[PDB]
Amino acid sequence: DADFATLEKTSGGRLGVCLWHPASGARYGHRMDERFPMCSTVKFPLAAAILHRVDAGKLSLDQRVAVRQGDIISHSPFTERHVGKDMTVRDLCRATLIISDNAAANLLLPLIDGPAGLTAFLQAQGDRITVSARNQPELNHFAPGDPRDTTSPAAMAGNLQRFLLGDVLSPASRQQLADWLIDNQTGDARLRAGLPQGWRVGDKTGSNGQDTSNDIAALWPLAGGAPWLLSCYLQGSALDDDGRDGILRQVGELAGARL
């Protein structure tokens, strides 16, 4: 927890990291309780809330949601192909997670009573910090003192534990959720690029395109054993997307030396 301070100086802005090993209780990080904008990382608790409602019989992964032209916004590469028809909830979950389909998240949110319902879901599972207030794209707005669409590195690391390793979800739902993060397509130049060999990575990313990039991940040891959880938030950085990706890569390098 001193390498992160040195790394934060390179970034500019605020760097929040939480590396947690639940089986042993080891914890490393920096600004672990400060609030950072979630950006697209809000899609991970969004998918878990969907699966939890599915496990409760109040929703089905095979029910289909209509897609109209008004639902399409920027960076929605899968939902834009289904204007005038429908898509299964399962495919909407996959699209919003592995490629960060923005419209797919706006179509999943009303199924769990919107951002207010997502916050109510997070509070019921034990997360009293994370606040989900808006949908895409305005959830990327952030200002100090404004807790809307924010989380903490420790809170999101705990959510990774509850939904992937805990018993919040059914064994089939939590394994499907892990498989989605493993199939992520947007994190090759971020945490994955710095993490060492011998670990399976599942992650979800986020970015505002100017000064904020986030990446939360689960670290399964390929040689068997208990997994780690790594949340990383970088807000207000002076580096652009490629530079912030380099900071996220170095976070993976620092975490790899602590495994």
Cα(167)–Cα(165) distance, rounded to whole angstroms?
7
- Owner of token pair 């089939």: 172
Beta carbons within 8 Å of 94's beta carbon, 6+ residues apart: 180, 183
Mind telling me the catalytic residues?
40
For residues 97 and 64, the answer to whether their CB atoms sit within 8 Å is no
- Owner of token pair 């706006």: 106
Q: Where are the alpha helices (DSSP H) in 16-68?
A: 43-55
Cα(63)–Cα(91) distance, rounded to whole angstroms?
10
- Token digits for 181? 């993060």
One-letter amino acid at 240 equals D
Cα(140)–Cα(146) distance, rounded to whole angstroms?
12
- Token digits for 94? 């996959």
3-state secondary structure of 131: strand
- Token digits for 21? 């090993």
For residues 250 and 7, the answer to whether their CB atoms sit within 8 Å is yes
Beta carbons within 8 Å of 13's beta carbon, 6+ residues apart: 211, 234, 235, 236, 237, 238
E-strand stretches of 146-226: 150-151, 199-207, 213-221
Which CATH code for domain 3-56+113-256? Answer: 3.40.710.10
**How was this entry determined?**
X-ray
Cα(107)–Cα(80) distance, rounded to whole angstroms?
12
